[PDB]
Design a protein around this ligand. Structure first.
Ligand SMILES: Cc1cc2nc3c(=O)[nH]c(=O)nc-3n(C[C@H](O)[C@H](O)[C@H](O)COP(=O)(O)OP(=O)(O)OC[C@H]3O[C@@H](n4cnc5c(N)ncnc54)[C@H](O)[C@@H]3O)c2cc1C
Ligand SMILES: NC(=O)c1ccc[n+]([C@@H]2O[C@H](COP(=O)([O-])OP(=O)(O)OC[C@H]3O[C@@H](n4cnc5c(N)ncnc54)[C@H](OP(=O)(O)O)[C@@H]3O)[C@@H](O)[C@H]2O)c1
Length: 524
């Protein structure tokens, strides 16, 4: 059968995909079809329904900003929002802009083959059908594939095995014996939510992490209205900031003030709450200066030692090393360990021997009775959802052979040898990866497509020299941080632009004004 021919294909129905379909169809009038493996929209907020799921950014900012009427209709109950609220918000956006009919849900894109003679992309699905399109927009997230630790004799357990990425909604664990492995952001959130309802909780710790409070407080009607009356100024300042989190970012060097004043600013941020506020709203050299970083790390350690009453229990949860990741927060995570029904096992000192029929025995002889075992282990990286599908550009070159070593890009949204092919939150993009960052990229992509249609452009792609130049820029910015030292969230090659959202917006604007510097344009 002959494929369906459309202007644009969109892959993924999260924040990015929803916005791209709305810009491409409703604004520019282009024919558009979108896909997602999920049975509905939501993206990461469709898949992740574990108890405790929470926004890392505050409620009034964890949403779209492009529509002024939609912002004035928003509502929320606490300073942060849960997964059910975010899912309902994205579902209502889909209905408000009549986007649902443009999507094929429950469908996977299995291949994308560029045909140079026709200057069209051939897209085929796991369910049989075939499309051809002029532009492909990839909003495929960072899901990659779930991680599962193969513990000896796993399929002996007569209980339930649950991974946080596949939580069966409505599952009731009140009154059960539960184990959790994993103490990342997801583990901390699940541990906090389960502990007041379960009969017993056993946390298998491998590497404790730094975490600050979140400060999720109730909100009144008058506060929501105050935010709504200054919405334009609020978004204008967020879009010029570096981390786009709602606070003023400090330029004050940490070791330049007295120890009393340093302790006061740390404590004021800690009482407020916020991972980003603590790392970037207190001083300006926590990520760049050794002594500044140590000061913040040991302040968090002293907070953990005050909270946890048992000193032997505090020791197992005491983090060490550079305070240098994407800043975690929590809603009473440390206090959980003072409950008498919560036990912590340090896997490095007391490793798991192998799991029995109804529990896990460890190497000192103790078997912990468990009804269910929760796996809060992670996934992989950004390139995971790109490398698992057949993507072939000019001369049929595979995306794996093109990114033979490390995922590269030009300005985070394109790559050489792959014309009319764009990435939302791809490699070499900004580390800040929230809605306002998504809006920036989807808006650049939509404008570039409009520019091509108006000026009769048949194919745009970046030059290899422009791509290499962008890689140099991301590595130079990265090598001024402490992150590089040792190995941070990286591939030996950098993986993110760390200049902040405002500097990233200035780069994108300059490229367009300079007549799309870096891109070859094939006319006619
Ligand atoms: C619990 C949690 C809390 C978070 N909180 C924050 C926060 O507050 N701030 C922040 O900045 N970030 C946060 N993040 C992450 C960030 O918001 C997301 O990375 C971002 O929303 C990505 O939006 P997206 O639309 O690009 O991708 P996603 O939401 O990940 O959606 C991508 C979609 O593409 C689909 N897809 C992928 N490959 C294919 C394929 N081959 N065929 C078909 N469909 C495909 C997937 O099914 C998926 O639904 C959080 C993440 C989690 C898990
Ligand atoms: N960008 C944002 O704003 C934002 C916000 C929220 C969430 N997120 C994303 O959410 C993810 C974090 O959630 P997550 O907790 O699922 O991932 P994670 O950060 O990778 O945590 C996985 C946890 O499981 C442990 N673990 C993994 N394999 C193990 C094994 N074989 N044996 C024992 N323990 C094992 C890890 O310990 P070790 O560390 O010792 O290996 C770690 O504690 C990341 O992808 C992050 O980017 C992002």
């Amino acid at each position: 059968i002959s494929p369906t021919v459309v202007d644009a294909v969109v892959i993924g129905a999260g924040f990015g995909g929803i916005y791209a379909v709305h810009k491409l169809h409703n604004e520019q009038g282009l024919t558009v079809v979108g896909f997602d493996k999920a049975d509905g929209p939501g993206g990461t907020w469709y898949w992740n329904r574990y108890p405790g799921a929470l926004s890392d950014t505050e409620s009034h900012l964890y949403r779209f900003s492009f529509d002024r009427d939609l912002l004035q209709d928003g509502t929320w109950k606490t300073t942060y929002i849960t997964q059910p609220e975010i899912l309902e918000y994205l579902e209502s956006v889909v209905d408000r802009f009549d986007l649902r009919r443009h999507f094929r849900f429950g469908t996977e894109v299995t291949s994308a083959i560029y045909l140079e003679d026709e200057n069209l992309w051939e897209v085929s699905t796991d369910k049989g059908e075939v499309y051809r399109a002029k532009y492909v927009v990839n909003a495929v997230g960072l899901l990659s594939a779930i991680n599962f630790p193969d513990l000896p004799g796993l399929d002996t357990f007569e209980g339930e095995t649950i991974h946080t990425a596949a939580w069966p909604e409505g599952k009731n664990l009140a009154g059960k014996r539960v184990g959790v492995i994993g103490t990342g952001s997801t583990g901390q959130q699940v541990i906090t939510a389960l502990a007041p309802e379960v009969e017993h909780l056993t946390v298998f710790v491998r590497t404790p992490q730094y975490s600050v409070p979140v400060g999720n407080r109730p909100v009144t009607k008058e506060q929501i209205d105050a935010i709504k009356a200054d919405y334009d100024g609020i978004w204008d300042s967020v879009k010029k900031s570096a981390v786009a989190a709602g606070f003023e970012e400090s330029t004050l060097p940490a070791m330049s003030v007295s120890e009393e004043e340093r302790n006061r600013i740390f404590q004021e941020a800690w009482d407020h709450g916020g991972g980003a506020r603590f790392m970037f709203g207190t001083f300006g050299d926590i990520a760049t200066d050794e002594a500044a970083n140590e000061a913040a790390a040991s302040f968090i350690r002293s907070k953990i030692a005050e909270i946890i009453e048992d000193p032997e229990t505090a020791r197992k949860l005491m983090p060490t090393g550079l305070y240098a990741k994407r800043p975690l927060c929590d809603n009473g995570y440390y206090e959980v360990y003072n409950r008498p029904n919560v036990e912590a096992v340090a896997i490095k000192e007391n490793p798991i021997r192998e799991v029995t029929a109804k529990g896990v025995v460890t190497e000192d002889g103790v078997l912990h009775e468990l009804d269910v075992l929760v796996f809060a282990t992670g996934f992989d990286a950004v390139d995971g959802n790109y490398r698992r599908i057949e993507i072939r550009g000019r001369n049929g070159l595979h995306i794996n052979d093109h990114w033979d070593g490390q995922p590269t890009s030009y300005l985070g949204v394109t790559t050489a040898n792959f014309p009319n092919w764009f990435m939302v939150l791809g490699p070499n993009g900004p580390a800040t990866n929230l809605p306002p960052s998504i809006e920036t990229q989807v808006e650049w992509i939509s404008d570039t497509v409009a520019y091509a249609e108006r000026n009769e452009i048949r194919a745009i792609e970046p030059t290899p020299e422009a791509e290499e130049e962008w890689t140099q820029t991301c590595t130079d910015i990265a090598n001024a941080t402490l992150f590089t030292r040792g190995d941070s969230w990286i591939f030996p090659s950098v993986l993110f632009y760390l200049g902040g959202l405002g500097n990233y917006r200035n780069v994108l604007a300059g490229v367009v004004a300079d007549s799309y510097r870096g891109f070859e344009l094939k006319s006619a």
